[PDB]
Design an enzyme around this catalytic site. Structure first.
Site, PDB file in Angstrom:
ATOM      1  CD  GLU A   1      47.834  39.867  31.793  1.00  0.00           C
ATOM      2  OE1 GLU A   1      47.534  40.061  33.098  1.00  0.00           O
ATOM      3  OE2 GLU A   1      47.402  39.336  31.176  1.00  0.00           O
TER       4      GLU A   1
ATOM      5  CB  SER B   1      43.144  36.490  36.965  1.00  0.00           C
ATOM      6  OG  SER B   1      44.484  36.278  37.839  1.00  0.00           O
TER       7      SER B   1
ATOM      8  CG  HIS C   1      46.221  40.494  36.281  1.00  0.00           C
ATOM      9  ND1 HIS C   1      46.118  39.391  35.260  1.00  0.00           N
ATOM     10  CD2 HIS C   1      45.705  40.019  37.172  1.00  0.00           C
ATOM     11  CE1 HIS C   1      45.962  38.254  35.886  1.00  0.00           C
ATOM     12  NE2 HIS C   1      45.541  38.588  36.820  1.00  0.00           N
TER      13      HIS C   1
HETATM   14  C1  LIG Z   1      49.375  43.916  50.429  1.00  0.00           C
HETATM   15  O1  LIG Z   1      50.285  43.921  51.486  1.00  0.00           O
HETATM   16  C2  LIG Z   1      51.445  43.090  51.008  1.00  0.00           C
HETATM   17  C3  LIG Z   1      51.612  42.512  49.847  1.00  0.00           C
HETATM   18  C4  LIG Z   1      52.655  41.905  49.673  1.00  0.00           C
HETATM   19  C5  LIG Z   1      52.681  41.359  48.223  1.00  0.00           C
HETATM   20  N1  LIG Z   1      51.800  40.341  48.239  1.00  0.00           N
HETATM   21  C6  LIG Z   1      51.967  39.405  47.303  1.00  0.00           C
HETATM   22  O2  LIG Z   1      52.868  39.366  46.325  1.00  0.00           O
HETATM   23  C7  LIG Z   1      50.531  38.253  47.076  1.00  0.00           C
HETATM   24  C8  LIG Z   1      49.781  38.528  45.684  1.00  0.00           C
HETATM   25  C9  LIG Z   1      48.695  38.973  45.593  1.00  0.00           C
HETATM   26  N2  LIG Z   1      48.553  38.887  44.270  1.00  0.00           N
HETATM   27  C10 LIG Z   1      47.222  39.374  43.489  1.00  0.00           C
HETATM   28  C11 LIG Z   1      46.505  38.127  42.767  1.00  0.00           C
HETATM   29  C12 LIG Z   1      45.383  38.781  41.657  1.00  0.00           C
HETATM   30  C13 LIG Z   1      44.127  38.635  42.215  1.00  0.00           C
HETATM   31  C14 LIG Z   1      43.325  39.134  41.414  1.00  0.00           C
HETATM   32  C15 LIG Z   1      43.078  38.945  40.106  1.00  0.00           C
HETATM   33  C16 LIG Z   1      41.861  39.716  39.176  1.00  0.00           C
HETATM   34  C17 LIG Z   1      42.319  40.873  38.574  1.00  0.00           C
HETATM   35  C18 LIG Z   1      42.583  41.996  39.580  1.00  0.00           C
HETATM   36  N3  LIG Z   1      43.334  42.874  39.225  1.00  0.00           N
HETATM   37  C19 LIG Z   1      43.599  44.190  40.118  1.00  0.00           C
HETATM   38  C20 LIG Z   1      44.436  45.177  39.428  1.00  0.00           C
HETATM   39  C21 LIG Z   1      44.742  46.187  40.450  1.00  0.00           C
HETATM   40 CL1  LIG Z   1      45.760  47.499  39.763  1.00  0.00          CL
HETATM   41  C22 LIG Z   1      44.307  46.243  41.804  1.00  0.00           C
HETATM   42  C23 LIG Z   1      43.606  45.071  42.258  1.00  0.00           C
HETATM   43  C24 LIG Z   1      43.176  43.920  41.402  1.00  0.00           C
HETATM   44  C25 LIG Z   1      42.482  42.966  41.787  1.00  0.00           C
HETATM   45  N4  LIG Z   1      41.898  42.894  43.168  1.00  0.00           N
HETATM   46  C26 LIG Z   1      42.010  41.947  40.821  1.00  0.00           C
HETATM   47  C27 LIG Z   1      41.258  40.756  41.285  1.00  0.00           C
HETATM   48  C28 LIG Z   1      42.116  39.885  42.169  1.00  0.00           C
HETATM   49  C29 LIG Z   1      40.957  40.002  40.286  1.00  0.00           C
HETATM   50  N5  LIG Z   1      49.429  38.479  43.868  1.00  0.00           N
HETATM   51  N6  LIG Z   1      50.278  38.231  44.503  1.00  0.00           N
HETATM   52  C30 LIG Z   1      53.754  41.586  50.470  1.00  0.00           C
HETATM   53  C31 LIG Z   1      53.605  42.083  51.772  1.00  0.00           C
HETATM   54  C32 LIG Z   1      52.459  42.984  52.064  1.00  0.00           C
HETATM   55  O3  LIG Z   1      52.290  43.501  53.291  1.00  0.00           O
END
Ligand SMILES: COc1cc(CNC(=O)Cc2cn(CCCC[C@H]3C[C@@H]4Cc5nc6cc(Cl)ccc6c(N)c5[C@H](C3)C4)nn2)ccc1O
Ligand SMILES: COc1cc(CNC(=O)Cc2cn(CCCC[C@H]3C[C@@H]4Cc5nc6cc(Cl)ccc6c(N)c5[C@H](C3)C4)nn2)ccc1O
Ligand SMILES: [Cl-]
Ligand SMILES: [Cl-]
Lengths: 532, 532
Positions: B324, B197, B437
């Site tokens: 992913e 990632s 992912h």
């Molecule tokens: C959480 O609350 C909210 C969330 C959102 C939406 N937030 C977002 O879109 C911001 C966001 C956050 N991310 C996560 C980035 C990926 C980080 C990690 C990658 C690596 C693989 C991984 N896979 C995971 C799979 C699952 Cl199913 C659960 C947790 C995982 C995880 N922590 C990781 C880590 C972090 C390592 N993408 N976008 C909006 C409003 C909210 O109140």
């Protein structure tokens, strides 16, 4: 006696013609307009003045002046569409096939030939109405109308060459049928108009035109619809093409009156010789002189009429063939040939896309290419060939017809949709061309019932089913016979969008004809081109 | 004795750890930089000053300060990714697992954790390097680096918060490995960096960065590439986000010096509390503080470096997982839930597309919708759900990686590509999320070899195959053992573009991974958005 009919324009004498193992009456070459010759060239038609004596209606009339296809001399596949009578500007005649004994008040069907608004004859062997009239007990009419510049030169604002006069020719023939078909045993309140390609577009144009709607009951459209991209131009584009036509003939261009006067002194073949030189783009499936959106025949844009329900509300039956594009690629696209399987290279594919979508910018051309390319297998010459075939047919025929079907069905009184996908066993055209534009017509007109034409027994049965669908629809507004246990052709509805295949296997019902590609052509690509 | 190592920064004392039915040595929490605390917050790292005495390397270090996922409290599927040690800005440490007896000069692998550049720990159970070090006889290093604003706040032109300092943290750990891994039995001329990632993106960034290239031999990228749309921002956008961060914390914004001074007085959790408030769009798979294209770490745009071959030429092994997108939709898109099958309505699909492609205009959103919608079946909640899953994974991971693979392979010395599509039998996440992912990592690190973790025998065998591929690639530049009769993982070439599936069935070779969708994302959609 059975061959003598008194009409409102005078008496006509027909002829007794054999059909299968019986006979019917034929009244061939009946005039419905004054000859549009001399100073009447380009002008709206006038009604035929009544005549004294007996009109000899025993032989086919002249065909209208037109471009003649010589790409395959002696080849029956192309020559069967060419004029089979002498060409003349004196060509506004209709033909009538009448069952024997003469009916009292039976269903009438009026055939409108196609040919891109630049060609067509009522007299082709494949349009012989005797099998349909005999088998289904209808009065079968075929009309004629001026094509090319003679029918569609458009100088809007002028009354000498206003445009759309070929469509007014069609309307005048429908008026004559309305006024006179009763004397032949036809029911003037049960007239169905039907046509293929430009004749299908024409049928749709009479549905839309307020001045035509009252002259028929219901309608059948084969492989053509009024909103097709090739079927009309704006008044500005029609004027540009008329002026360019005069430039090709060394005409005075300073006023409509001078231009029209110059064009009227030219022999017919001089107009035909330069007619193709006025197109604005390098293109296929585009024709020089076509209906013009004039504010009179069509009061507003075709799209706003379809959106508002400004059209005749009746029953319609319509459909398309599987491989509408192949004919146009053979004649107009590099890499295609009659005597090879025409496997298409990547370069010839890109040339073909550009020919097929002439109005598109580079982004639009990329969008078309992506939609029709298998990028796992992009050098497959058969997939490139069939992909271009689909592009041409989807863009020019199928997706415009599906847009028309969906707009019409919101206000209409019953829609029946078909997909004709049978390749005739005796087809003289190569196999890569598939189910070709125009090759359902021989099944509609009953040619497979003629043993000597070498169709199969399954194809005779298919022809009989199609003729019965068409004539039962004409008679009742529904192609299905009630109380019969044959499988039913369902209504096309806005919600379920059902259609049937037309072929030699048992009827199958499908839904959403080519919906994926028609979202691309009818919604996405127009939006892309408008924003860019 | 085996647990005592003299390095250039001082002596370190490790610990003997059991692994399967044997033991290895572990040196945990070795400092490679000065603590980036106080007035060193946001600044480039400095080398750790050498120490007297013996460094106790028997326990894991602190994790860096970061956002902690509390969406499913107590749920192992999400908590397994959270910091498992106390958080501290004092967090620049690395960990080393060394076979027993200590090797002389063996292959080194350096793990770079991911977590969107805002999270990640070297100390997670799933990153335990002991199974890989023991099974494959490698020296396994895991580094750490500052994440979030601490690692990536970027005020270009300032030397106090220049941006990219998390990447410089990684580089300083690689420098320490280059300078010291020989004393642990590692070969400093045979270091492979690998990461998932954001760690995969980071690996790619060290391939590109002239200042990093000399510090490793070859590279492995899992589910991430340097050109991913979430992986970097311009200096203008980084500056905008830094200023917006200060606005959220009532900082003086009149100069870089005042802003940085204000931000340095805040407790760590106050930055974390507002970090997500600075994103420019309503989005998923977008993070606030990421690498900046600064003209120093990256001399030019990533695209012009890839086009010109301005990167390290070596062997690479890389790939993606089948689903992913599913993790990001679960956390951020309406209609998705952990405990339901998350069938997606048409309205939630359109909301999801808008979240997934935040930079797109309405025409771009229509293009995405058309590409991923089955218009024969557009109210199928499973197809809408899986279509959004594909959009998110294609746009953010797979198609950027395929663009990187194709640019790299033109100049590189050997490319091996995989598609991991095995769903673990013991997965705690719902079945709709598929192959998630991050869930190939447990197979790379050998967790299926642990009986108590409840994997199948086939999954242990898959883990052993993957660990052997990775370590053999690290050792030789080729994942295949020579002279062996196992099926061969072929080189990815520009012409044939071969890849393998990674799962429990016999190896299958495929070509052109998701080529159709990646033409859309890599060629057509950028062109559309640029013209509009
Ligand atoms: C959480 O609350 C909210 C969330 C959102 C939406 N937030 C977002 O879109 C911001 C966001 C956050 N991310 C996560 C980035 C990926 C980080 C990690 C990658 C690596 C693989 C991984 N896979 C995971 C799979 C699952 Cl199913 C659960 C947790 C995982 C995880 N922590 C990781 C880590 C972090 C390592 N993408 N976008 C909006 C409003 C909210 O109140
Ligand atoms: C011919 O020479 C050239 C041709 C081109 C290319 N020309 C064009 O693209 C102009 C064009 C001409 N057309 C034909 C319009 C269709 C007219 C007819 C429609 C009806 C069904 C039909 N089908 C036929 C199928 C085959 Cl395979 C052969 C002939 C057919 C045919 N004549 C008809 C008629 C006409 C009735 N589309 N585009 C460029 C340069 C050239 O030198
Ligand atoms: Cl075919
Ligand atoms: Cl799934």
């Amino acid at each position: 006696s059975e061959l003598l009919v008194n009409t409102k324009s005078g008496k006509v004498m027909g002829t007794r013609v054999p059909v299968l193992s019986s006979h019917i009456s034929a009244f061939l070459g009946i005039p419905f307009a004054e000859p549009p010759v001399g100073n009447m060239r380009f002008r709206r038609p006038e009604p035929k003045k009544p005549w004294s004596g007996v009109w000899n209606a025993s032989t086919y009339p002249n065909n209208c002046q037109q471009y003649v296809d010589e790409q395959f001399p002696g080849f029956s596949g192309s020559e069967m569409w060419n004029p089979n009578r002498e060409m003349s500007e004196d060509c506004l005649y209709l033909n009538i096939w009448v069952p024997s004994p003469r009916p009292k008040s039976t269903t009438v069907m009026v055939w409108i030939y196609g040919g891109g608004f630049y060609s067509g004859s009522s007299t082709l062997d494949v349009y012989n109405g005797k099998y349909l009239a005999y088998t289904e007990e209808v009065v079968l009419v075929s009309l004629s109308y001026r094509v090319g510049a003679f029918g569609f030169l458009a100088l809007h604002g002028s009354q000498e060459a206003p445009g759309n006069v070929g469509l007014l020719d069609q309307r005048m023939a429908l008026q004559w049928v309305h006024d006179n078909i009763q004397f032949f045993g036809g029911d003037p309140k049960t007239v169905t108009i039907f046509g293929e390609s430009a004749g299908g577009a024409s049928v749709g144009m009479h549905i839309l035109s307020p001045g035509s709607r009252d002259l028929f009951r219901r309608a059948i459209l084969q492989s053509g619809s009024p909103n097709c991209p090739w079927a009309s131009v704006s008044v500005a584009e029609g004027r540009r093409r008329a002026v360019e036509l005069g430039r090709n003939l060394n005409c005075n261009l300073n006023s409509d009156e001078e231009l029209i006067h110059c064009l009227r002194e030219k022999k017919p073949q001089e107009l035909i010789d330069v007619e193709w030189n006025v197109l604005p783009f390098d293109s296929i499936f585009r024709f020089s002189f076509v209906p013009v959106i004039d504010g009179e025949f069509f009061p507003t844009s075709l799209e706003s009429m379809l959106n508002s329900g400004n059209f005749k509300k009746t029953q319609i039956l319509l459909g398309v063939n599987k491989d509408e594009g192949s004919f146009f690629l053979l004649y107009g696209a590099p890499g295609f040939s009659k005597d090879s399987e025409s496997k298409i290279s990547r370069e010839d594919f890109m040339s073909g896309v550009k020919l097929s979508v002439p109005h598109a910018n580079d982004l639009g051309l990329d969008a078309v290419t992506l939609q029709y390319t298998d990028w796992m297998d992009d050098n497959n010459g058969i997939k490139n060939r069939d992909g271009l075939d689909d592009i041409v047919g989807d863009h020019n025929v199928i997706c415009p017809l599906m847009h028309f079907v969906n707009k019409y069905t919101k206000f209409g009184n019953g829609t029946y949709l078909y997909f004709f996908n049978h390749r005739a066993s005796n087809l003289v055209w190569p196999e890569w061309m598939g189910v070709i534009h125009g090759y359902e017509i021989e099944f509609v007109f009953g040619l497979p019932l003629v043993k000597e034409l070498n169709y199969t027994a399954e194809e005779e049965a298919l022809s009989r089913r199609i003729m019965h669908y068409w004539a039962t629809f004409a008679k009742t507004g529904n192609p299905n016979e009630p109380h019969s246990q044959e499988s039913k052709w369902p209504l096309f509805t806005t919600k379920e969008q059902k259609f049937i295949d037309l072929n030699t296997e048992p009827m199958k019902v499908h839904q959403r004809l080519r919906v994926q590609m028609c979202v691309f052509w009818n919604q996405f690509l127009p939006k892309l081109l408008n924003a860019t």
